[PDB]
Design a protein around this ligand. Structure first.
Ligand SMILES: Nc1ncnc2c1ncn2[C@@H]1O[C@H](COP(=O)(O)OP(=O)(O)O)[C@@H](O)[C@H]1O
Ligand SMILES: Nc1ncnc2c1ncn2[C@@H]1O[C@H](COP(=O)(O)OP(=O)(O)O)[C@@H](O)[C@H]1O
Ligand SMILES: [Mg+2]
Ligand SMILES: [Mg+2]
Lengths: 419, 213, 206
């Protein structure tokens, strides 16, 4: 009846559903084709069919309603919307549209939208009056996103260390710097679990670029939110498309006074896709990266801000360093001081089998007075006073044993004042 | 009526202003487009429209009146000035021009300047006789810009230390050397507050390059 | 069959000559219409002629007119084409009063050498050009009009000052794109606009 649940159902249920409807030879076809075949057979029955998706306005004028299940990939089951709907209902890219759809008539291969009754989880009339994201005035982060989980076991202290290293708030534009094989993949998993548990209201989005297929499955099964990704086999034009879709969708949610958190991975890989797709403008910098090529990722990364009117957009990205590629290090140079939060991971700490491998001295956040209270903020200052003299390799080891014997970070603070 | 106050007004007031004038679908557009749409609808009414901006002469010959609200960024609401105005009124880049503007005729997308009645906050005739900046003879600083504020609390002593460390005067060309995360961002804030408070007459300009939003 | 539907659809007198009729009949019909049209013009009356087709008409004149000893390419005599040019060139706007408008269709790419040479003589003889593209027609997109090639001469008098310049900016954005997709661009844009006036303001929006 509704396209939303058909994609969520496994392929096995779809095969059984299609067989009783009279369809045949469905197991050997793709999942997208099965959905189209099932809808087509149900469409001619006469019962109304609903749908949902994310609008993607093309340069021609007509758009499509991509689905987050397929990672916003074009497919036969995508809903086609004529430019007339964009006229009557003023819509932009990334808008969420849910409504009745009509069967495709001969001469067209895509379903068409009949009527719109829900735009961005709101009435269509109210969505027309929402202020644009650009017109919103950015501000510093005010409310802190707690990272410590009470149910979290003492085996993994990554969540607790992040609170001591660099607190994160709504609208933060933090950047993660880490060499390869430094544990950055599961570092975001701890952040995703903490955000989902401590702040269920916040919308969590995980974006993966050039990630292995196995990595995508575990992220979807672990993160309590919609996760989109693009495998390495997909062309470069697909990687940029996924990134553009997520940021546009995130901006629309911000306009509705809603908080959305994006865990980008990785900014270095994302800039590679933009460099390839964007044609050369005649100016080539070191490493073969065009100056105009890096303009797009900066605008995407810089969109993170705290809106004074309401809502916030928090973007956390991982930067790859010491990867052996000249093109990778030059990108990190452009994104050096562009973030208000720095989280540096050390390779030499990681090889010592001590986790989390966080360089406490280098990592930090800017304007942390607003995030933390008066007492909590000054308790971190004295902690940094005793961690700075010691080496970074043993600095993490010092915190690991101290945090192990303390149930919570509050107990750790009073212990430090004891000596 | 005047472009100067339209930019200062928030976006919410602009939406309400446009709706009663008959405009529709303004919330989803940029602020610059809203100003252009509001001016266009008001232009056809018949009432005169004023404007203000900073001249930016291009290499072709024609200039534009950029606005400080948009950080001198090119936009649809920028006022276009033909080279004829630069001829009759000898103007250079950075000049402040305020005067009546005309609605854009078809085939052009920018407003045009009708007449000039204020150049650099002065009569246009007097502005033509001003001596060029290069011809002026430089000199050492004479009058000191006081940095200590009486209303300043004892919590922040940055203003007082600057007086003891290195006094600053009019025409000074000081340079600040500081490593990253050394408190230089709010160091200028204390200077800006002291200059604005102690010397309200002085024109204060803050320029930021590659700064976070 | 084509004749019957034209008579039943056109709100005016329609004359035609079937293919079975001899060549001497085709010229007779053409001469009768132009002579009748000229007389109406003399009475300060406006007459519009939709000729179809000028290529076929020249074939009839070539057959009936005896050879004068000079044969051009394709077997068309120079004096043979003199008559259709005078018939086609009779269209004009009379200063005293009335007008005579003649619109004719020229056949090209018909596979006949005689057809293409006739079009060469009638290339720059008209003040209005309306070229249709075969490749647009096979795409099942109509009308299959080559916007870039089609045009009119001295259009300032026909249109107003505002309307004329609104077409210039339209041609400024249609020229860069290909002719095959140029018509497709106009079809969708005109579909969402009730009238051409609404189409003009939409273009200025972007
Ligand atoms: N908090 C942690 N606790 C235990 N092991 C960790 C932790 N973080 C990383 N690791 C180790 O790192 C390895 C995975 O690293 P990975 O996340 O793939 O790095 P990268 O993403 O840079 O390739 C695992 O084998 C795991 O043992
Ligand atoms: N006069 C001051 N009083 C108190 N704190 C200060 C002062 N100047 C700088 N700071 C500290 O510096 C931090 C901000 O540094 P910042 O100006 O961002 O340095 P940079 O501009 O080099 O990055 C704040 O957290 C603040 O606590
Ligand atoms: Mg990884
Ligand atoms: Mg700074």
């Amino acid at each position: 009846m509704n396209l939303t649940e058909l994609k969520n159902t496994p392929v096995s249920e779809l095969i059984t559903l299609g067989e009783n409807m009279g369809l045949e030879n469905l197991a050997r076809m793709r999942k997208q084709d099965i959905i189209f075949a099932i809808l087509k057979q149900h469409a001619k029955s006469g019962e109304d069919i609903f749908g949902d998706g994310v609008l993607e306005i093309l340069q021609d004028g007509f758009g499509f309603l991509r689905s987050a299940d397929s990672s916003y990939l074009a497919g036969p089951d995508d809903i086609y919307v004529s430019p007339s709907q964009i006229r009557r209902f003023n819509l932009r890219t990334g808008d969420t549209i849910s409504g009745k759809i009509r069967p495709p008539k001969e001469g067209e291969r895509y379903f068409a939208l009949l009527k719109v009754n829900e735009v961005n989880f709101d009435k269509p009339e109210n969505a027309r009056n929402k202020i644009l994201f650009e017109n919103l005035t950015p501000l510093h982060a005010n409310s802190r996103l707690r990272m410590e989980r009470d149910n979290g076991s003492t085996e993994d202290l990554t969540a607790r260390v992040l609170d001591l290293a660099s607190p994160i708030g709504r609208g933060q534009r933090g950047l993660i710097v880490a060499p390869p094989k430094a544990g950055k993949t599961m570092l975001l998993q701890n952040i995703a679990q903490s955000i989902a548990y401590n702040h269920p209201d916040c919308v969590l989005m995980v974006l993966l670029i050039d990630e292995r297929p196995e990595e995508v499955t575990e992220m979807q099964r672990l993160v309590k939110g919609e996760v989109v990704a693009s495998t390495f086999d997909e062309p470069a034009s697909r990687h940029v498309q996924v990134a553009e879709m997520v940021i546009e969708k995130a901006k629309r949610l911000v306009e509705h006074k809603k908080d959305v958190i994006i865990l980008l991975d990785s900014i270095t890989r994302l800039a590679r896709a933009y460099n390839t797709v964007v044609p050369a403008s005649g100016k080539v910098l070191t490493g073969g990266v065009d100056a105009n090529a890096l303009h797009r990722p900066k605008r995407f990364f810089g969109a993170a801000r705290n809106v004074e009117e309401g809502g916030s957009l928090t973007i956390i990205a991982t930067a790859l360093i010491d990867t052996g590629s000249k093109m990778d290090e030059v990108i990190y140079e452009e994104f050096k001081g562009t973030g208000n939060m720095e989280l540096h991971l050390s390779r030499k700490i990681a090889e010592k089998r001590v986790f989390p491998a966080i360089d406490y001295n280098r990592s930090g956040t800017r304007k942390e007075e607003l995030l933390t209270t008066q007492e909590e903020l000054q308790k971190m200052w004295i902690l940094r006073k005793i961690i700075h003299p010691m080496g970074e390799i043993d600095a993490m080891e010092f915190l690991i044993n101290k945090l192990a014997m303390t149930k919570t970070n509050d107990d750790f603070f009073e212990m430090m004042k004891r000596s």
